[PDB]
Amino acid sequence: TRDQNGTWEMESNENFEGWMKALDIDFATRKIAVRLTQTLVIDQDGDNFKVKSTSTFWNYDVDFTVGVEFDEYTKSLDNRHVKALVTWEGDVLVCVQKGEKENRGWKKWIEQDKLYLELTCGDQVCRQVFKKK
Numbered sequence: 001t002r003d004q005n006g007t008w009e010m011e012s013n014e015n016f017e018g019w020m021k022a023l024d025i026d027f028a029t030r031k032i033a034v035r036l037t038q039t040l041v042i043d044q045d046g047d048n049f050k051v052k053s054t055s056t057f058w059n060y061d062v063d064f065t066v067g068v069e070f071d072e073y074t075k076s077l078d079n080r081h082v083k084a085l086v087t088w089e090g091d092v093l094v095c096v097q098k099g100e101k102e103n104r105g106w107k108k109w110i111e112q113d114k115l116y117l118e119l120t121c122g123d124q125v126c127r128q129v130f131k132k133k
């Protein structure tokens with residue numbers, strides 16, 4: 001399925017610190033953030049997505065349209081400018097963020113009835129699983 005709507009609560013998190021390190025996130029921020037459970041809220045209507053990543057320590061919101069490139073500031077993550085594009089490869093939603101970092105973006109799919117996320121930067125991959133309603 002391509003339908004990713006829901007409130008998604010983290011069940012599993014692997015190599016989140018490696019991913020943050022590859023983004024050069026400072027030591028203090030990484031050490032706190034790696035401890036935390038996360039929620040991902042996805043509102044999806046056709047190509048239009050509104051996504052909210054939250055924990056006790058951050059809020060990172062982004063809206064995008066599948067197939068439409070957008071210039072993006074990554075704000076309180078790593079304060080960088082990238083050129084972002086989100087597209088479908090089958091039922092895997094793929095984001096590529098062009099800029100300073102290589103292999104930066106994510107892949108997201110519903111293989112379960114859970115949400116799977118791969119966050120990538122450089123040679124680092126973080127893998128997460130969330131459970132929905």
Ligand SMILES: *C/C=C(\C)c1ccc(-c2ccc(N(C)C)cc2)s1
Nearest residue numbers: 033051053058060062076077106108
């Ligand atoms: C569709 C999935 C998106 C937009 C994201 C998944 C995780 C994200 C994220 C994780 C961690 C942070 N910080 C500030 C540690 C920000 C965003 S966005």
